[PDB]
Design a protein around this ligand. Structure first.
Ligand SMILES: [Fe+3]
Ligand SMILES: [Fe+3]
Lengths: 192, 192
């Protein structure tokens, strides 16, 4: 039985970038529901004893949608943090500069892809199997886990992720997303 | 040059089922933006001068997404109305009963499909080339116009259509949607 991992911080820790109200709905209702959905769908199936990643790589339809959504959201919450954001340093900074030229270029490209992601979806910074970094976007519950690329950072662009706080202004949401990036988590993802 | 058609009723005419704030954003900002996006994208091209339908039936990428979105939204605004909703009578009532057995059955199935539509999309009631009615759903900006089916009724299930008024409660949104259905429009679409 899967459970909703506890948020990594206080419900109001991401304010004003992401409100406590958005956390209440996005984490407390949406994410929670995906967990319940998954448990319901895999009950009595061969998926029961499998890890989240394992189910994501061997399922389709509702099972896949909910499994991928549970994983994507948990990853998303860890990509955010209070007293973070800004420009990265250390290994992450070097890696980003090596693949995109500079952080500024990376940022613009990431923001552009996230804003251009049509409909519901996710935009990611990944580390390809060849060690190089790249920006890719997925639709709906899609995830880089079904490929050989390693997710390092993500932004949820389903409208529920920002409508309470930004309405249709996805660009404003992205702007504030940058002020919340947990580069420590990104570094851990990169060094793994 | 395409323009945003005027709303068929006052901004607060659909309340409390759909708020004036939702119209302010959904119609005033979202819809308006697809219109501008479309004009910018086709200026100086062979699409300039064509009708929405013609562009929708001969484009792809951003031109299609916006042309389809403009058409879909104007159609949606016409599917709603104050002092309407309820159960239909006349031609629409007969057609629905003939294809679904009873309005009750139709209503349940249309609602189910709309709630199941994963991600952003639209759920429609259409009349196939054989004259029979059917319920079909499209993703993102997809529309029945790219098929041989004739759209009769539609419900927008992109989260921006209901998040302000219902947050994650799409079922509640659908409940109130029925209270707004403009059967006069549906009848006009059916008899065309
Ligand atoms: Fe989400
Ligand atoms: Fe819409």
């Amino acid at each position: 039985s899967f459970e909703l991992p506890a948020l990594p911080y206080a419900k109001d820790a991401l304010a004003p970038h992401i409100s406590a109200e958005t956390i209440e709905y996005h984490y407390g209702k949406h994410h929670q529901t995906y967990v319940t959905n998954l448990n319901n769908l895999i009950k009595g199936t061969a998926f029961e004893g499998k890890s989240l990643e394992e189910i994501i790589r061997s399922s389709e339809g509702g099972v896949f949608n909910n499994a991928a959504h549970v994983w994507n959201h948990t990853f998303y919450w860890n990509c955010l943090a209070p007293n973070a954001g800004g420009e990265p340093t250390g290994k992450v900074a070097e890696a980003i500069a090596a693949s995109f030229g500079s952080f500024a270029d990376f940022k613009a490209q990431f923001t552009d892809a996230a804003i251009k992601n049509f409909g519901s979806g996710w935009t990611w910074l990944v580390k390809n199997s060849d060690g190089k970094l790249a920006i890719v976007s997925t639709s709906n519950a899609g995830t880089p886990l079904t490929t050989d690329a390693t997710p390092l950072l993500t932004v949820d662009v389903w409208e529920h992720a920002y409508y309470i706080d930004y309405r249709n202004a996805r660009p404003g949401y992205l702007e504030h997303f940058w002020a919340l990036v947990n580069w420590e988590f990104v570094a851990k993802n990169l060094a793994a």
